[PDB]
Design a binder for this molecule. Structure first.
Ligand SMILES: [Fe+3]
Ligand SMILES: [Mg+2]
Ligand SMILES: [Mg+2]
Ligand SMILES: [Mg+2]
Ligand SMILES: [Mg+2]
Lengths: 191, 211
């Protein structure tokens, strides 16, 4: 038996706030960070830059932290970054099987599905079937590699750049790099 | 801790509730949902009452049926509340009074944790390693699917962090270790019963030994 979750969450807030342990505007400030600042649009910007700038691509793949810091996008749950490169024979996918660990500042907070027991249990063992069910077909001639986020490394996938985007601006490329492309369950599509 | 939270490889679950690029809705689906993370950070960064590792562990310590029936953000409301009570900052009485009803918490720890091991090895990219065949009842950042298994180092971190098995219990002896991206063949982890290629687990130095 439990009180409604909203009542329990606000009780926790009120118990701490009522003892002076929560600075003024504290939870409101975090809410703004979570809703407005942490965003997969940032990861998309990084990918589009890497796609159009071989030098940055090299930095991103060798020192992800430094590359992300150049854009000012390090942050909570995103202080040590490793980018993992898809290739014609390799598809990378990220999970946190133990909870929900995600590169928050550049991917945004994890979505419900990524935190689901279904994804946490299944993608490590049957990633091809999981991606297929989610709408992404990965051929047998492609190695699937699942990164389980079990420590402090926070990952992003650098997907392959699709044919048909040659010459596109960074802005145009950013639009096709979605949250799901950064997690690795989707491949960027030409609209 | 071999709890129900160690889900990787568990069989019997249905479809992931998502198709690619589908609308996931707003970041928060209810007006309270930003509270668990924000209050976690108040506890960690403002009060210094606990580490993030202690938050992971207190969630692992939910009674197993309770864990399995509780949505994500609610688990962190329960976990943060539990730590506040365990650290003597709040009482369960006042939480229940303010909530207007029952506010069951995670179960007490059954382990005092363990220190960062004194004896470890610095590994290099390309080296073959085995995950120590050890059983730890308290917090550990080793999913069971890789226990005792052999893989290859693909990265050694250029930073070091406290050993989760210690800091996750608030111990003073967590030291600092780098972690290693250890690549395992899918078949090393699940035999023939997998459709994948490889799995890379980010493992603390103290979980590893030469192969
Ligand atoms: Fe996690
Ligand atoms: Mg080209
Ligand atoms: Mg043009
Ligand atoms: Mg188990
Ligand atoms: Mg419920």
């Amino acid at each position: 038996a439990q009180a409604p979750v909203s009542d329990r969450a606000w009780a926790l807030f009120r118990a701490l706030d009522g003892k002076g342990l929560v600075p003024d505007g504290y939870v409101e400030g975090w809410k703004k960070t979570f809703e407005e600042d942490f965003s997969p649009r940032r990861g998309a910007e990084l990918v589009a830059r890497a796609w159009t700038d071989p030098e940055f691509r090299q930095l991103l793949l060798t020192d992800g932290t430094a590359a992300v810091a150049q854009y000012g996008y390090l942050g909570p749950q995103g202080e040590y970054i490793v980018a993992v490169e898809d290739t014609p024979t390799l598809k990378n996918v990220i999970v946190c099987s133990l909870c929900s660990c995600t590169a928050w500042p550049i991917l945004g907070l994890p979505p419900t599905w990524y935190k689901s027991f279904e994804y946490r249990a299944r993608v490590v063992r049957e990633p091809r079937k999981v991606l297929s069910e989610m709408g992404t077909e990965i051929a047998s001639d492609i190695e699937i590699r699942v990164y389980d986020t079990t420590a402090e490394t926070r990952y992003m996938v650098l997907p392959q750049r699709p044919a048909g985007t040659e010459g596109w601006s960074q802005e145009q490329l950013q639009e096709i790099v979605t949250k799901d492309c950064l997690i690795g369950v989707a491949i960027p599509q030409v609209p | 801790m071999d709890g129900v939270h160690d889900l990787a490889g568990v069989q019997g679950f249905g479809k992931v509730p998502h198709t690619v690029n589908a609308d996931i809705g707003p970041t928060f689906h209810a007006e309270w949902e930003h509270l668990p993370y924000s209050l976690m950070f108040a506890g960690v960064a403002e009060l210094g009452a606990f580490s993030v590792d202690e938050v992971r562990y207190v969630v692992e310590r939910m009674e197993p049926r309770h864990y399995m029936m509780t949505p994500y953000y609610e688990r962190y409301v329960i976990g943060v509340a539990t730590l506040m009570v365990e650290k003597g900052i709040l009482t369960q009485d006042e939480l229940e009074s303010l909530a207007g009803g029952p506010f069951p918490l995670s179960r007490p720890s059954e382990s005092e944790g363990r220190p960062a091991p004194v004896e470890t090895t610095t590994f290099e990219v390309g080296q073959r390693v085995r995950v120590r065949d050890e059983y730890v009842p308290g917090h550990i950042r080793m999913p069971a699917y890789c226990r005792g298994r052999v893989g290859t180092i693909s990265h050694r971190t250029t930073e070091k962090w406290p050993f989760p098995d210690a800091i996750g219990h608030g111990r003073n002896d967590a030291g600092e270790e780098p972690t290693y991206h250890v690549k395992f063949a899918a078949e090393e982890l699940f035999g023939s019963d997998t459709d994948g290629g490889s799995v890379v687990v980010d493992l603390f130095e103290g979980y590893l030994e030469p192969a």
